[model samples]
Target: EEEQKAKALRGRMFVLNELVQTEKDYVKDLGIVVEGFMKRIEEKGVPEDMRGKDKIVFGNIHQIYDWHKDFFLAELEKCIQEQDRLAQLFIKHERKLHIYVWYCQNKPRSEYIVAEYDAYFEEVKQEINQRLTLSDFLIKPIQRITKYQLLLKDFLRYSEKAGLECSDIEKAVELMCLVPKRCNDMMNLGRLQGF
Candidate 1:
């Protein structure tokens, strides 16, 4: 779906770059598009809970670029309506953020970026380690991390709609306890922690 929308936008840009004859009409059309998208965002509220995970709510991030396109048009129209070149440039400057968001989403990350992320993960791991001691363990470290990541992802992914159909913490704790208990039973010497 996103690919098709992107293709359509690319085709429009091509036409504007190489074939469009009336610059005034082009500018006006762009403004109309920007305004329509902005109104849509105001109509649709930001994604729930997932707002905590990112700078802009995940749902809103997807719509932000198109919103700017509308504002750009409104600014252009105002500039022409009032013969204000300064206002036009300021509006154009606002459009830069749209370009920036696009670039960040599309850009390929390198070793430098990956290293930074790794360091970030290490910092988080140290924080978690400080809270958890070996004797306090129920679930294994790797399994706990995996389960936590799963919950976080699910929470973010379904922020738009309510009522997740899934197991909760009790079920998870019971399952984790079972995995190690099974091993403990066979070994006979291994002590299992009671939940």
Candidate 2:
């Protein structure tokens, strides 16, 4: 029946909608780190000398956030009309996550810096009237690091079940699936010891 095809595209549409919306949410969360935590960290609480090392505290999150805000989400928004653009877009942008790799590798370094100046971040958190702690905001990037592929998996499942050609979609999942393990490791390693 045509149900397969219809259901499949339905799933595709669903996945794409979720992707765009989630990117919006993710980008907003990153902004908290960029505009909220990072901004206040530098301007409000930390000492002058600490400022140089402070950029490292968020690693490359500003880069990640800006890339999505300025360019990537726009492309994702385009995919709703041109559904065929879906899988290839993910595959093409796979290398873009080298920024994330840079983030993950430096995340431990981020932890060290934030941990050392924990009190200052606390001061700024209340000063800014933020509900979550600074570390809570800092953790978003690592979690975002894992979010895309789950959506890609949703894409692949619908593609396969709907009997659509999924060569590119499957490949997107393949390329993306390798990502989370490393992010998870970094999340663990970046875990601050009870201090």
Candidate 3:
């Protein structure tokens, strides 16, 4: 039993190292962003009780919720100032990941889904590569990817039924259009976007 436990612990640690090796610096910086957002929210109160009493908010105000990251990053190009090249590049990558999660969900069993994701990712990568610089970390990759995953893995899983909620999809579409401020104002709630 002791030997088996030792082997399992070593195996897990090995996998952890491999997983984090390529993105060590990037992931560390991402952690900083998350910590910053957490501290900020703790210091400054959220917008309000926007979505509903039925909803339990996850993230803080000003910082976009993870589930809503897709909706936010989809509009990122409009948000970035032309002078902020790093912000633009970071958003381009984020937007690609957002598309990946959507592709995964919508085409769960399709080989074609991976192809679609590859094509979309390559197109965006090329666009960003031409104008890329290391400073893109200003917007931070970790926070964006974390948000995408949060939304991707668990988006509307329990609350919204898939087949009958196409109208709910329409509502999400409309919610996407409303600025956070408007959404909060109308709904009278503030929260990090989640289930």
Best by lDDT: 2
Residue 152 displacement (Å), model 1: 45
lDDT of each: 0.33, 0.80, 0.33
What total of clashing residue pairs does each candidate reach?
Answer: 4, 0, 9
- Candidate 3 residue pairs in clash (backbone atoms < 3 Å): 48-189, 48-190, 49-188, 49-189, 49-190, 50-189, 50-190, 59-192, 65-193
Which portions of model 3 miss their true places by more than 4 Å?
Answer: 1-22, 49-195
For residues 1-195, could you state the per-residue lDDT of candidate 2 as single tens digits? 797789887988999999999889888878877888777766665687686777777767889989989998899999989987988887888888777767877777777888888887788889778898878887776676567788888888888888878888888887777777766665576665432
Q: What is the per-residue lDDT of model 1 for residues 97-160, given as tens digits with 9 covering 90 to 100?
A: 3333332232222122323344332343354433432112211222322333343333323321
Model 1 accuracy (lDDT, Cα) = 0.33
Tens-digit lDDT string for candidate 3 (117-192): 4443234334433233222322333234444333322322322232223344334333333323242342333222
Instruction: List the lowest-lDDT window of 10 residues for candidate 2.
Output: 186-195
Q: Could you tell me which 10 consecutive residues in candidate 1 have the lowest summed lDDT?
A: 133-142
Instruction: Rate residue 119 of model 2 by lDDT.
Output: 81
The better-scoring model by TM-score among 2 and 3 is 2
Reference-based lDDT, residue 50, model 1: 24
Question: What's the TM-score of each model vs. the native?
Answer: 0.21, 0.87, 0.20
